[PDB]
Design a protein around this ligand. Structure first.
Ligand SMILES: [Ca+2]
Length: 319
């Protein structure tokens, strides 16, 4: 049918470690492009640096702008609907900010608009090496991982830049450099407006967040969490998808760094942007993109259906 048939093409934009297809085999947006296309949507999947800042000449933002232009040329369209996961949402904001005439909407899924306490943590861990050699060694490993897994073996990988970009202090600077009507006041845990208009260009702004990881007990200055996406302990998702327990682990570090409810690496407050459709999904960070390989806990909503319904929402909104 045409349930997901939007006026403007939808460009799905990946975040950290990403590419359109890992090693040219595993779709980042698992089963999403096919689902949307089957429902009549025109969908393109960006392939940007998995590790980089969003701004800068070598950044993901310029890469996405360049890609948007090739999509407009190929389809004959004048604007696109940007849907970004995690850092992809920040990249989408960059394009909406520098080329408002080419964007009709920006939807962010689990995007760290205010940064990540987990990025703050990882950056701090690196600082404890007195020699600084681990920064060089680990960055090299990660950069190589990015080049090897990129579908096109993109050599533009800068793990340290990516890490810095996702920290809370740097995200605050990014927000000053690239403001948006969809963002509320820093430190307020509020969203902004549902739209932004610059000159004759209006952008429909949306967002949702996964809050599977909930702080549930505090003892001796230590906060314990619960992964609400799963049936306690026995959920097959803990067995079939290694990221389920991994994100519960990172999510625990998050709550102990004062993040509050989160998806494993992005807090609810950090994810707020534009019209906040929901922050109640019992999803971890990868459940948001139907990963790994479609496995999610028993209490987790269907992410394929959520994204599809949103394509229809965009259609109904006129974009
Ligand atoms: Ca999962």
């Amino acid at each position: 049918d045409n349930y997901a048939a939007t006026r403007y093409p939808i460009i799905l934009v990946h975040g950290l470690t990403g590419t359109d297809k890992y090693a040219g085999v595993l779709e980042y947006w698992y089963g999403i492009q096919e689902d949307l296309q089957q429902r009549g949507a025109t969908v393109y999947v960006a392939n940007l640096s998995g590790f980089q800042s969003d701004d800068g000449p070598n950044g993901r933002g310029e890469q996405l702008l360049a890609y948007v232009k090739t999509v407009l040329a190929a389809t004959g369209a004048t604007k696109v609907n940007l849907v970004g996961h995690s850092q992809g949402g920040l990249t989408s904001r960059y394009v909406a900010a520098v080329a408002p005439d080419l964007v009709a909407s920006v939807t962010t899924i689990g995007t760290p608009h205010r940064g990540s306490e987990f990025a703050d943590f990882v950056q701090g861990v690196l600082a404890y090496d007195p020699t600084g050699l681990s920064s060089t060694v680990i960055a090299a490993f990660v950069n190589v991982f990015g080049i090897l897994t990129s579908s096109s073996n993109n050599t533009n990988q800068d793990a340290l830049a990516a890490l810095k970009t996702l920290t809370t202090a740097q995200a605050a600077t990014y927000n000053q450099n690239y403001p948006s009507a969809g963002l509320g006041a820093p430190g307020s845990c509020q969203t902004g407006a549902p739209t932004e208009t610059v000159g004759g260009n209006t952008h429909l702004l949306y967002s949702w967040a996964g809050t599977a990881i909930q702080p549930t007990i505090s003892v001796f200055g230590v906060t314990g969490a619960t992964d609400t996406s799963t049936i306690p302990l026995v959920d097959p998702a803990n067995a079939l998808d290694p990221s389920t327990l991994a994100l519960f682990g990172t999510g625990t570090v998050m709550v102990n760094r004062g993040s509050g409810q989160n998806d494993g690496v992005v807090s609810k407050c950090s994810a707020l942007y534009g019209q906040v459709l929901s922050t109640s999904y019992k999803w971890n960070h990868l459940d948001e993109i139907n990963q790994l390989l479609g496995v999610r806990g028993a209490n987790a909503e269907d992410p394929v259906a959520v994204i599809r319904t949103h394509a229809n929402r965009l259609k109904l909104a006129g974009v």
